[PDB]
Homo-oligomer: A and B are copies of this chain.
Amino acid sequence: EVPLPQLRAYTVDASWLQPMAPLQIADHTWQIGTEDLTALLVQTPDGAVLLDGGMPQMASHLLDNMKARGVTPRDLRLILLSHAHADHAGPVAELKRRTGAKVAANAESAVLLARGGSDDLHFGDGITYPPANADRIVMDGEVITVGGIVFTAHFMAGHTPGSTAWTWTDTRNGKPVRIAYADSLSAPGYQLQGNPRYPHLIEDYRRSFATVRALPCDVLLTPHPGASNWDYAAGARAGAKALTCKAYADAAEQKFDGQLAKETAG
């Protein structure tokens, strides 16, 4: 006779969990996550901002890299998120407990975060993580300012209802650099058409392709660096092959159209 199956842990490619030292993107912006998961530190004269944290087991590594950059736990003021799945918001609860950081997110991301990713529209309870509360709810196009760096929220619903692109302007060589951190545009294993949990899913993805295409975007970064052709292990040429926001959106839409056609056939 047969017991119910054991719970299955959320396991990922080893490179997603491979720690790296801080990689500078612009004058105040650093990649401090792992080889294949983005976690951006923005350092200001008035505290630091973290955008995404990667997987749940990455908290101490993130804190180590912040320390290397001169950022103590007290100095981290704000956490922002691309979307509230386990491999990007994983360590948020722990980071809040261990730092001064407060979380700002839109309503959709906040409720999913507060559920620890449970009851996912597509994944069910398959990919959960420690829940956390948002300290501030943001609306589309709203700005948040830290130490004089201005972050703008651009909603791009689809991958999750609360998927967000964050944009800000840094400097490099005395010139402004408009950085766009665009969320995933993938739909891995999703039912796209006639999904009872997400009836306007296709319309939202189409709108989000257009949103991403139009972002202020000298430099594109994505939660999975491979999606924008970043190679965090490539040192001085880490960002050399990076896509434009236009190319990223076009590639995503072509892939999406292919998935729709396969779904109709399958």
Residues of A within 8 A of B (CB): 1-12, 14-19, 34, 46-47, 55-58, 61, 74, 77, 93-94, 96-97, 100, 102, 107-108, 110-111, 114-116, 118-119, 121, 125, 128-131, 133, 135-137, 139-143, 161-162, 196-200
Nearest 3 A/B pairs, CB to CB: A141-B199, A9-B9, A118-B130
User: How far is the CB of A171 from the nearest CB of chain B, in Å?
Assistant: 24
Once the chains bind, are B200 and A34 in contact (CB under 8 Å)? Answer: no
Give the interface SS of chain A, mostly helix, strand, loop or mixed. loop
On chain B, the residues within 8 Å of A102 by CB distance are 100, 102
Query: Max chain B CB contacts within 10 Å: which of A34, A139, A196?
Result: A139
Specify which of B16, B111, B141 is in contact with A111 (CB 8 Å cutoff): B111
On chain B, the residues within 8 Å of A141 by CB distance are 199-200
Copies in the complex: 4
Query: Max chain B CB contacts within 10 Å: which of A7, A34, A56, A129?
Result: A7
User: How far is the CB of A8 from the nearest CB of chain B, in Å?
Assistant: 6
CB-nearest residue of chain B to A121: B139
Q: Known interface pairs A128-B130, A130-B116. Does A11 touch B19 (Cβ–Cβ under 8 Å)?
A: no
Once the chains bind, are A18 and B47 in contact (CB under 8 Å)? Answer: no
On chain B, the residues within 8 Å of A131 by CB distance are 114-116, 118, 131
Once the chains bind, are B17 and A6 in contact (CB under 8 Å)? Answer: yes
Q: A4-B55, A110-B111 are in contact. List 14 more A-B contacts (CB 8 A).
A: A7-B55, A7-B56, A7-B57, A74-B77, A94-B125, A107-B107, A107-B161, A107-B162, A116-B130, A125-B130, A128-B129, A131-B131, A139-B198, A141-B200
Bound: A229/B40 CA distance, A: 54
User: How far is the CB of A96 from the nearest CB of chain B, in Å?
Assistant: 7
Bound: A196/B138 CA distance, A: 10
Once the chains bind, are B56 and A74 in contact (CB under 8 Å)? Answer: no
Specify which of B58, B93, B128, B142 is in contact with A197 (CB 8 Å cutoff): B142
On chain B, the residues within 8 Å of A17 by CB distance are 3-6
Once the chains bind, are A14 and B3 in contact (CB under 8 Å)? Answer: yes
Once the chains bind, are B9 and A6 in contact (CB under 8 Å)? Answer: yes
User: How far is the CB of A108 from the nearest CB of chain B, in Å?
Assistant: 5
On chain B, the residues within 8 Å of A57 by CB distance are 4-5, 7
On chain B, the residues within 8 Å of A61 by CB distance are 4
